[PDB]
Amino acid sequence: SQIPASEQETLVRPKPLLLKLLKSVGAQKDTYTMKEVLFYLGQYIMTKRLYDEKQQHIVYCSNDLLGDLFGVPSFSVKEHRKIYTMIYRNLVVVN
Numbered sequence: 001s002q003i004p005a006s007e008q009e010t011l012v013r014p015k016p017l018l019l020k021l022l023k024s025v026g027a028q029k030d031t032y033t034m035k036e037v038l039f040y041l042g043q044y045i046m047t048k049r050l051y052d053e054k055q056q057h058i059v060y061c062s063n064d065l066l067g068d069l070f071g072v073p074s075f076s077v078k079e080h081r082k083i084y085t086m087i088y089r090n091l092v093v094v095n
Ligand SMILES: *CC(=O)Nc1ccc(NC(=O)C*)cc1
Pocket: 035, 039
Protein backbone atom coordinates (compact mmCIF):
# COMPACT_ATOMS: atom_id res chain seq x y z
CA SER A 1 0.00 0.00 0.00
CA GLN A 2 1.34 3.42 -0.91
CA ILE A 3 2.81 5.56 1.87
CA PRO A 4 0.08 8.09 2.85
CA ALA A 5 0.54 11.13 0.59
CA SER A 6 1.08 13.34 3.64
CA GLU A 7 3.89 11.04 4.86
CA GLN A 8 5.91 10.84 1.65
CA GLU A 9 9.10 12.88 1.81
CA THR A 10 9.39 15.99 -0.39
CA LEU A 11 12.68 15.62 -2.27
CA VAL A 12 13.97 18.84 -3.76
CA ARG A 13 16.80 20.36 -5.82
CA PRO A 14 17.53 24.00 -4.94
CA LYS A 15 17.80 26.26 -7.96
CA PRO A 16 21.30 27.72 -8.30
CA LEU A 17 20.90 30.89 -6.23
CA LEU A 18 19.35 29.05 -3.25
CA LEU A 19 21.98 26.31 -3.62
CA LYS A 20 24.69 28.95 -3.36
CA LEU A 21 23.04 30.22 -0.16
CA LEU A 22 22.86 26.72 1.31
CA LYS A 23 26.46 25.95 0.33
CA SER A 24 27.57 29.08 2.18
CA VAL A 25 26.63 27.46 5.47
CA GLY A 26 28.13 24.07 4.62
CA ALA A 27 25.56 22.26 2.45
CA GLN A 28 27.47 19.99 0.08
CA LYS A 29 24.81 18.17 -1.99
CA ASP A 30 22.50 19.00 -4.87
CA THR A 31 19.38 17.21 -3.57
CA TYR A 32 17.78 17.46 -0.09
CA THR A 33 14.62 16.79 1.79
CA MET A 34 12.53 19.82 2.60
CA LYS A 35 13.55 19.47 6.30
CA GLU A 36 17.21 19.77 5.36
CA VAL A 37 16.62 22.94 3.29
CA LEU A 38 14.84 24.47 6.30
CA PHE A 39 17.75 23.48 8.56
CA TYR A 40 20.26 25.24 6.35
CA LEU A 41 18.02 28.34 6.04
CA GLY A 42 17.97 28.50 9.80
CA GLN A 43 21.79 28.20 9.90
CA TYR A 44 22.12 30.94 7.28
CA ILE A 45 19.85 33.42 9.06
CA MET A 46 21.52 32.62 12.39
CA THR A 47 25.07 32.87 11.03
CA LYS A 48 24.54 36.25 9.35
CA ARG A 49 22.48 37.43 12.33
CA LEU A 50 19.66 38.68 10.09
CA TYR A 51 17.09 38.40 12.89
CA ASP A 52 15.97 41.20 15.16
CA GLU A 53 17.94 40.89 18.40
CA LYS A 54 14.80 41.57 20.47
CA GLN A 55 11.96 40.05 18.41
CA GLN A 56 13.94 37.10 17.13
CA HIS A 57 11.16 35.68 14.94
CA ILE A 58 11.64 38.71 12.71
CA VAL A 59 14.14 38.40 9.87
CA TYR A 60 15.49 41.37 7.87
CA CYS A 61 16.67 40.55 4.36
CA SER A 62 16.13 43.49 1.98
CA ASN A 63 19.92 43.87 1.64
CA ASP A 64 20.45 40.07 1.45
CA LEU A 65 20.47 37.49 -1.26
CA LEU A 66 17.73 35.88 0.89
CA GLY A 67 15.42 38.80 0.16
CA ASP A 68 16.00 38.48 -3.57
CA LEU A 69 15.24 34.76 -3.38
CA PHE A 70 12.15 35.08 -1.15
CA GLY A 71 11.02 38.33 -2.80
CA VAL A 72 10.39 40.21 0.47
CA PRO A 73 12.23 42.81 2.54
CA SER A 74 11.55 41.03 5.87
CA PHE A 75 9.38 38.29 7.35
CA SER A 76 8.47 36.45 10.53
CA VAL A 77 9.40 32.83 11.17
CA LYS A 78 5.78 32.53 12.34
CA GLU A 79 4.59 32.93 8.72
CA HIS A 80 4.77 29.19 8.08
CA ARG A 81 2.71 29.03 4.86
CA LYS A 82 4.30 32.13 3.28
CA ILE A 83 7.81 30.86 4.01
CA TYR A 84 6.99 27.45 2.61
CA THR A 85 5.73 29.18 -0.51
CA MET A 86 8.83 31.41 -0.74
CA ILE A 87 11.12 28.38 -0.51
CA TYR A 88 9.19 26.28 -3.03
CA ARG A 89 9.70 28.88 -5.74
CA ASN A 90 13.50 28.41 -5.35
CA LEU A 91 13.63 24.66 -5.98
CA VAL A 92 12.39 21.87 -8.19
CA VAL A 93 10.66 18.80 -6.77
CA VAL A 94 12.46 15.55 -7.57
CA ASN A 95 10.03 12.77 -8.40
C1 LIG B 1 8.08 15.83 11.37
C2 LIG B 1 9.52 16.34 11.23
O1 LIG B 1 10.22 15.97 10.35
N1 LIG B 1 9.97 17.27 12.23
C3 LIG B 1 11.28 17.86 12.33
C4 LIG B 1 12.34 17.41 11.56
C5 LIG B 1 13.59 18.01 11.73
C6 LIG B 1 13.72 19.02 12.68
N2 LIG B 1 15.00 19.65 12.83
C7 LIG B 1 15.56 20.12 14.04
O2 LIG B 1 15.00 19.97 15.08
C8 LIG B 1 16.95 20.76 13.87
C9 LIG B 1 12.65 19.46 13.45
C10 LIG B 1 11.42 18.85 13.28
